[PDB]
Each structure stands twice: as structure tokens, then as C-alpha cells.
Amino acid sequence: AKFLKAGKVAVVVRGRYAGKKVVIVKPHDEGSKSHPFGHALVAGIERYPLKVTKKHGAKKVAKRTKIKPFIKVVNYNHLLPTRYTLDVEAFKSVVSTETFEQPSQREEAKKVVKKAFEERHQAGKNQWFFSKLRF
Amino acid sequence: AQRVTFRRRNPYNTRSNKIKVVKTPGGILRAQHVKKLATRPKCGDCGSALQGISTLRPRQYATVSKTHKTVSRAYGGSRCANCVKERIIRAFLIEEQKIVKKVVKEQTEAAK
Amino acid sequence: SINQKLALVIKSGKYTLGYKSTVKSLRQGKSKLIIIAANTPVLRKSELEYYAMLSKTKVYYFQGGNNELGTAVGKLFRVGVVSILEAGDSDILTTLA
């Protein structure tokens, strides 16, 4: 079977975002004209949320739970796929091959991914995805 | 064919004082002391020279910006790319093995 | 034997020799069986095991080094891992080997 499909969680091993957790939105096994290799569009976490305790209150909690996202085109050789999954139904339409040729579409995609990630984190779902990998 | 000598107190051919011969704008040959060459920073895991980091004397790093002595990747400026990749892969696999071992222990203690 | 089946696969079937080719075929889901030499490094072996678990690909631990596995395959160079895309004329897949 194939495991590099939409919704699969991966760990980036090369590049500036090495060690960060991403989710695959659109796999391209045959590549593109601009990326002639097996690659994938991913949405990942650049700044993980900080832990919140009972001492923190109001504005501090709102500051600690902010999540910074990123959207990337990553070669398969630079990804380590996991066995975990995360739903990409909220933002599977904003991350496409066109998005990475238009910076405004990049801005909109990052905004949408940030909103979706913050909502999912505040819902308490996917505690493993929103936790830093210690390496 | 003019002969030159040291310009400082040390009269011995030590590593500290090394002489180059240069022709000054006066038309004469004169000695010049050369400083010790700088050494490239090395990776903390494999010892290979770090890529993308300028080579300077220890005290010259205090005067340059952070982009000239770091790399944008994690552990950038301390470890090279391959070592970081191995660290990530090893950490993930160790965590997975811990999960599997915990499940096995739970199953094997569930008999009683 | 197991060397005869491997030799027949190389003669008639489809195969990939090496770690990079094996991982690429595992990602593409075209692998039927992966034979792992005993000489392979532990990190690459564990990565291959995890990839096989993800892709549900059968694993056979070869009883020998990468050079013995290369000679068994029929190549005068070391091979650390072999992936069987198509058995072809041989029957290595049928006999659970």
C-alpha cells in the first residue's frame, strides 16, 4: 500500500524547518514542471504553542496558545512519515500548486492554516501534533 | 638582494613571530609580522568544518552579525545538516520503540 | 535454498538493489518483499522496518552480510537491501520466503 497520502503526519528532516511536524495536504508522486521530483505540499508548525497552567490568566493564556504555521513544498527524501493522521478537510483547498507561485495566495493559505490549527488545538484534539519533538 | 630581520623584541624563529618580506613604497624590502591563521568552526558531532560560517579569530566573532556565524536550520552553527538529520530520525524511532515496548508490557502484565 | 530463488528473481523478475531504491519503492507501494542483510547499519535497518510497517511489506532477514547477499543476488558488489517488485518466474513470494 501507499502511506504518503493526504492527512498523513510527517516530520521534516532537512531545511530550516528540520524537526518540525507537518501534515500532508496534496502529494505529487510524479512531481511538477518546477519540482521534477516526488514531492508533497505540507502545512506544519513553525512555533509550537506553550504550555498553560492555572497561574496564567486571561491575556497571558491568549498569548501562550498562539500558533505560527507554515506551508511548504517538501521532497519525499526530506520527510519522515509517521503512522499518525490529522484531518486536512478544513484547508485542503487553499494549499495547491498555484498557491506557491502567488505570494498573496501564500498569505491567505497561512492565515487559514493558522486559524484551523488554533481551533483544533483549543478543541484539545491532536495533542501529539502540537507537541515539540525533542532531538 | 637586501636582507631584513625581525621588527619586534623576539629574536627567535618561534611560531608566534613569523616574517613576510614586502617591498614598501620607498623602494626597499622590509619585514612584516603575520598573525596566526584562523581555524574553521567544526561540527560538534563529527568534527567536519561547518558550512556557511565565516572563519575568524576567537575575538573577531564578537564584532560580526549573527547571520555570519549561524545557519537558519536548528542547531545551525553548532552541528551540520547530516548530524541533525540523524538526530531527528533517531529521536523519532526511539520514541516509537518506547511506545511499542510500553504496549508490550501492558499486554504481558494484563494476563494476571 | 533461498539463493536459488533470489537468483531466479534477478534473472526473470523485477528488483531494486540498495537502500534508496528500496525506500522509493516502499513509498510508491510497489514492493512485495524486502530482504535485509545482517550487515546493514542499525539506524537504516530500523528506518526500513518502520517503512515496511507503514507500507505493510513483508520482511525477510537475510542470514549473511551485504557481500554475501550481493553474491547471492548475482552482483560482484555489496548490496545492503533488496526489494522484490515482481517475482516473475520464481516462487519466493509463494513459499513465505
Binding site: 507537541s131 | 515496548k101 | 510497517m53
Partner: peptide, 28 residues
Amino acid sequence: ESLFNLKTAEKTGILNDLAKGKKRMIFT
């Protein structure tokens, strides 16, 4: 500290669940 092993991955007797991402744990 030991790396992932397929033998101990099968000793638990549940490989479909693991490959499906069933047991998720956070340590430390």
C-alpha cells in the same frame, strides 16, 4: 535507548492498530 524493532512490534500482536496510529502517548 533502543530504536524501533519490528520483532517487538509484532510481539504485541496488533500491527494493524499500530500502522493505523492507534496508541498515541506523550512522555516527559
